[PDB]
């Protein structure tokens, strides 16, 4: 019981007119917020029928979901798609009823109920996060001297593959290291895109307190976010089919709310 939805984002076509779709896709945090906005529980749907209200994050269901933004070529054109997998029914009607300029085509919701056993060859294509935690973290490197401010800063930083090692093989063995826990096997994994994605979160702070109440003289700070990204496809061999359903319903990665994690599997 997995809803495999699909979006057809309306990008630009003239870099002299406003193109809100590309600007929206430029920031991953706004993409995540807009995708999460499609889940009104019982209050935002019935009280306001036109989404003309101030935004309240507590008014939306905290339903876990995965999404990957990518591109495809069907028969005569190139389309930017956002494949979204979720366990609750997505309310795309409530999401773009005011911002229909964002979307080029009406969305789709097709049920995905796979009954997959082991030992059958299947093909896949997923985008994954490529961060590791260094048990020996390098110091702060204060740029005036580039030695140290503190000593230890345990940080998710980057997956580094030696000096002359190939990146695709390194990513393949890194995935195959955790593959027995998940329950598949790789033979011809390949790397297509390897880069970074960027975002910015508000994360409000406080500066001054009111003359008669709480610290409502507060303003908005801004915390940037960076993510190392890999996109990889190939074929996987199914083992222990109980676990593969959990991996399909959960996703492989550490940034499942920022694109990485969704795995799309097709039969041979």
């Amino acid at each position: 019981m997995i809803y495999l939805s699909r979006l057809l984002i309306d990008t630009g076509g003239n870099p002299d007119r406003p193109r809100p779709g590309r600007k929206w896709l430029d920031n991953i945090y706004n993409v995540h917020r807009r995708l999460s906005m499609a889940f009104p529980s019982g209050l935002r749907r019935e009280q306001d029928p036109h989404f003309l209200k101030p935004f309240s994050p507590n008014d939306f269901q905290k339903t876990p979901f995965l999404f990957r933004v990518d591109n495809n070529i069907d028969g005569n054109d190139k389309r930017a798609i956002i494949i979204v997998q979720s366990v609750l029914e997505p309310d795309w009607d409530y999401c773009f009823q005011n911002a229909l300029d964002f979307l080029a085509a009406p969305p789709e919701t097709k049920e995905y109920n796979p009954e997959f056993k082991a030992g059958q060859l299947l093909r896949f294509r997923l985008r994954v996060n490529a961060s590791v935690r260094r048990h020996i973290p390098e110091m702060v490197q204060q740029d005036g001297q580039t030695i140290e401010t503190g000593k230890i800063l345990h940080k998710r930083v980057s997956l580094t593959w030696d000096a002359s090692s190939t990146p695709d093989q390194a990513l393949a063995d890194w995935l195959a290291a955790k593959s027995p826990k998940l329950g598949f096997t790789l033979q011809r994994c390949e790397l297509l895109q390897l880069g970074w994605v960027y975002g910015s979160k508000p994360e409000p702070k406080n500066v001054k307190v009111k003359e008669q109440g709480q610290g409502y003289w507060r303003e908005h700070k801004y915390n940037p976010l960076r993510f190392r990204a890999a996109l990889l496809e190939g074929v996987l061999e199914v083992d222990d089919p109980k676990l593969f359903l959990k991996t399909l319903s959960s996703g492989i990665g550490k940034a499942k709310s920022f694109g990485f994690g969704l795995l799309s599997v097709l039969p041979i």
């Binding site: 630009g12 076509g13 003239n14 870099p15 002299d16």
Partner: protein, 375 residues
Amino acid sequence: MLIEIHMIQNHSPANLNRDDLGAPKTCYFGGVLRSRISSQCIKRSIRTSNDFKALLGGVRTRRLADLIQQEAGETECWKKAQEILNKCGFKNKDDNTKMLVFMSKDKIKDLARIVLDNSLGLTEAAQQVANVIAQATLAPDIALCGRMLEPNDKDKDKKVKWSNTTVEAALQVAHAISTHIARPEIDYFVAADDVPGEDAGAGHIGESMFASACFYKYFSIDWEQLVKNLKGDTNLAAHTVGAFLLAAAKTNPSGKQNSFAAHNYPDGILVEFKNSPISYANAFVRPVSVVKESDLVEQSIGQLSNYVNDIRLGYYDEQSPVIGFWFSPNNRYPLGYKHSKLASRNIGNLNELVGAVLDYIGGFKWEEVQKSKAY
């Protein structure tokens, strides 16, 4: 009698004409967006072409004093030349003329002579300059493009009369419009840095534009007006007609050719001799939609053949017949498969087409008229 040229062309992805922002020029025809190449661009491409080099006898310039000084050797006369061009009603703005002047090159040396004589007063020299500027219009350049010169009145000195300056045009180039719905495309570009730095990427970031289309072109040459404009010369008129056909058949606008290089050739040409100018651009009111069997060019050729046959059988006249030549490269695309041969001759090579054009115009030989030239 007229000489009418209808062309079908196909272009690889390029940007041959841009506006003040950078986007390719577009238009609407039949309610749908079409890529457009302006008529002034096509006329400049023909006039500044290699095959039209032998007849480039006109210059449209604002820096006339520079040419006057280049004609002579003494430097100081240039200063006086500006003053001679000032009382003539032309004004100055940071050491050039305020408005462009179009004139034949071959007479410019006579202009210099008017400045070379120190016995002539300024008013009389200005009047002589006005006379030689207004009269110097015998060139194949202006012949087809015409001229319209308006001397300044708020600055001109008195007693400087002006003769007739307007030249009636003999060319009627239409705008070039595609035969389908246009598909403009963006193109993201960066400028890489050859020296490593602390950060990544650097340089410049931009988004250019380009489009690809199959176009329809129109040219119309009034034979009598061209002959009258050239003061009765027929050999020069035939040479101009042949050079124009060869240039417009084999030249492209020079817009962004260093990065797109769309040096394609036309693949269908219709040359007609009628008494009233006509346009077959109404064939493409319904845009050409490609299908799995045929391609884009032959579909446009079929629609053009349909419209041409319908027009010929509809607006037919008995006392005035038409004679048409149809050219395709090695008969790659015939003028329609269904209808009759809508051409007195079907030609597979361009040189025979030009020879037959000269034959129908006046029976002129090719090499006979190549001796007649202006520059």
